[PDB]
Amino acid sequence: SLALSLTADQMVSALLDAEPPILYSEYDPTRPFSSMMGLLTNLADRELVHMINWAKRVPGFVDLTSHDQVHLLECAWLEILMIGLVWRSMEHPGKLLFAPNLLLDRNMVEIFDMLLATSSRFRMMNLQGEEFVCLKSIILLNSGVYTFLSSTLKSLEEKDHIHRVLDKITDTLIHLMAKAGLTLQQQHQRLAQLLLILSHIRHMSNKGMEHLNVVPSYDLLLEMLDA
Amino acid sequence: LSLTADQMVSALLDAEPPILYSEYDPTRPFSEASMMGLLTNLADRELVHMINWAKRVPGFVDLTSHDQVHLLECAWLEILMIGLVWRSMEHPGKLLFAPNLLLDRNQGKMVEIFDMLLATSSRFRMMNLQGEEFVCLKSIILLNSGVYTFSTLKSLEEKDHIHRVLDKITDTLIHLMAKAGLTLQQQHQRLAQLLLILSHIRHMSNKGMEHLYSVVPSYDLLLEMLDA
Ligand SMILES: COc1ccc(N(CC(F)(F)F)S(=O)(=O)[C@H]2C[C@H]3O[C@@H]2C(c2ccc(OCCN4CCCCC4)cc2)=C3c2ccc(O)cc2)cc1
Numbered sequence: 050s051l052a053l054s055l056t057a058d059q060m061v062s063a064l065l066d067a068e069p070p071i072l073y074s075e076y077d078p079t080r081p082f083s084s085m086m087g088l089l090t091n092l093a094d095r096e097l098v099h100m101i102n103w104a105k106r107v108p109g110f111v112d113l114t115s116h117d118q119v120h121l122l123e124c125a126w127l128e129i130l131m132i133g134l135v136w137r138s139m140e141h142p143g144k145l146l147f148a149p150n151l152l153l154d155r156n157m158v159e160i161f162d163m164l165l166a167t168s169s170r171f172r173m174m175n176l177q178g179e180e181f182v183c184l185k186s187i188i189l190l191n192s193g194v195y196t197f198l199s200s201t202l203k204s205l206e207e208k209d210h211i212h213r214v215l216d217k218i219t220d221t222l223i224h225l226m227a228k229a230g231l232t233l234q235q236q237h238q239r240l241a242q243l244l245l246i247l248s249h250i251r252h253m254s255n256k257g258m259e260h261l262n263v264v265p266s267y268d269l270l271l272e273m274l275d276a
Numbered sequence: 277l278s279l280t281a282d283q284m285v286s287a288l289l290d291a292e293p294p295i296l297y298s299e300y301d302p303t304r305p306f307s308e309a310s311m312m313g314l315l316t317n318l319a320d321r322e323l324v325h326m327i328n329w330a331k332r333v334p335g336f337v338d339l340t341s342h343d344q345v346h347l348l349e350c351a352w353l354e355i356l357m358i359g360l361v362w363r364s365m366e367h368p369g370k371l372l373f374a375p376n377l378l379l380d381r382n383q384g385k386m387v388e389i390f391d392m393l394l395a396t397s398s399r400f401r402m403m404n405l406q407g408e409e410f411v412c413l414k415s416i417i418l419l420n421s422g423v424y425t426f427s428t429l430k431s432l433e434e435k436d437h438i439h440r441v442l443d444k445i446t447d448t449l450i451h452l453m454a455k456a457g458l459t460l461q462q463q464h465q466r467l468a469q470l471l472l473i474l475s476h477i478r479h480m481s482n483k484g485m486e487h488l489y490s491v492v493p494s495y496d497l498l499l500e501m502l503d504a
């Protein structure tokens with residue numbers, strides 16, 4: 050697997066190159082404001098197509114079976130959208146930048162508040178772009194890995210592979226921090242701080258999901274991967 | 277924040293709650309109602325001990341009573357779950373709810389969450405999770421799970437304090453791993469592996485919570501237990 054042979058700098062470059070664009074909502078500026086869920090749904094749907102193509106470019110992801118790729122996307126898709134949102138909003142305190150033309154302030158609200166808090170935490174930590182892309186790849190590979198159903202040798206090999214790629218991303222995070230001049234103690238503290246925010250992202254995804262053809266099915270994701 | 281890694285570990289080990297028994301001799305086999313009855317009774321008794329444990333986690337009682345309650349509100353089910361997973365580590369294919377309530381997957385059909393718990397227990401076994409590591413992780417859940425959902429200078433001071441204590445627990449985890457002879461690379465990889473499982477514990481708590489709704493200790497109950 051090429052993935053396992055990457056240096057930290059190569060991993061970062063691959064992830065940066067794979068980044069999807071920031072999409073715009075279909076809000077027509079020449080028409081009055083007088084649907085929020087309509088705009089968000091349309092935006093998320095377009096984002097999903099880009100997510101699939103991004104996932105295929107995350108080192109190690111295409112080494113997995115199509116089935117395992119789908120399972121990872123099924124578990125991670127909303128967390129991935131959410132972490133993208135929080136990243137885009139980092140420099141807009143008190144606001145969520147769903148798209149450059151869909152920037153919402155606080156004044157539904159429960160999940161909004163949680164997203165704002167995550168954005169504030171990212172700001173307070175001075176989260177870097179190189180760190181963000183590592184975290185988003187971790188979500189992809191980690192969120193679904195504990196819930197594989199198969200007992201086959203192949204499934205065991207798949208989980209081992211995922212954990213080895215995750216290990217490489219950890220190494221990458223640490224390398225970035227070391228190059229930035231953090232002491233060994235600071236490197237381990239910051240790694241922990243970043244990974245603990247993943248627990249909050251999960252929580253938000255679960256709450257978002259309960260706040261509810263909405264979720265992409267296994268079959269839809271499989272078709273999108275094969276296409 | 278004055279504690280060394282060794283002192284932190286000792287404090288956490290000394291704080292550990294007891295393992296409780298489920299009510300003695302239920303009618304078996306179980307109904308849906310009677311199984312949920314037994315588990316509820318066990319969890320309710322466990323909660324009292326959890327509060328006592330929480331008060332002994334370094335840094336926890338430095339917080340306002342209000343902030344202590346909020347942390348427990350967010351973390352209580354995850355804490356119960358990680359305790360269950362720990363107890364079950366040496367019983368492959370089974371969940372050791374209590375020494376007298378050991379259930380295999382064949383028993384209890386809600387099976388989705390059962391399977392997730394079993395998978396976590398398998399992951400802990402495969403990693404050879406150590407007791408010293410377990411207690412660090414449980415304390416992280418307590419301090420981390422509610423911290424992102426805390427404007428006054430006092431609240432900023434509270435969150436900063438929590439993050440400083442969390443930093444100390446990370447240092448403690450690393451110290452343990454270094455003493456065990458892991459290379460620096462191994463230490464960071466294992467730390468990440470352990471912290472990523474916490475995301476799965478959250479997921480399980482959220483799913484468990486939705487299942488309990490298809491429940492929570494009240495603010496008042498938690499406050500009373502803390503004050504008592
Ligand atoms: C009435 O107005 C609202 C608006 C939003 C909210 N929410 C809370 C908050 F406002 F954000 F605070 S929310 O409910 O939490 C929502 C935000 C986040 O979680 C949900 C979501 C999302 C995803 C897909 C989707 O529809 C896609 C359906 N299709 C996908 C498969 C194929 C076909 C179906 C709609 C929403 C998210 C998301 C999307 C894109 C993004 O960039 C970032 C985050 C509440 C009320």
Ligand SMILES: COc1ccc(N(CC(F)(F)F)S(=O)(=O)[C@H]2C[C@H]3O[C@@H]2C(c2ccc(OCCN4CCCCC4)cc2)=C3c2ccc(O)cc2)cc1
Binds near residue numbers: 311357387390483487
């Ligand atoms: C009909 O049979 C079942 C049995 C279990 C399940 N679940 C899945 C699984 F089997 F475990 F796999 S589950 O629903 O996910 C359940 C497992 C875990 O999560 C929940 C639970 C729990 C906690 C508190 C509670 O009641 C608390 C009520 N009081 C709180 C204070 C104020 C008063 C109210 C009931 C259940 C658990 C738990 C308890 C103690 C422990 O040590 C570790 C884990 C489904 C159906």
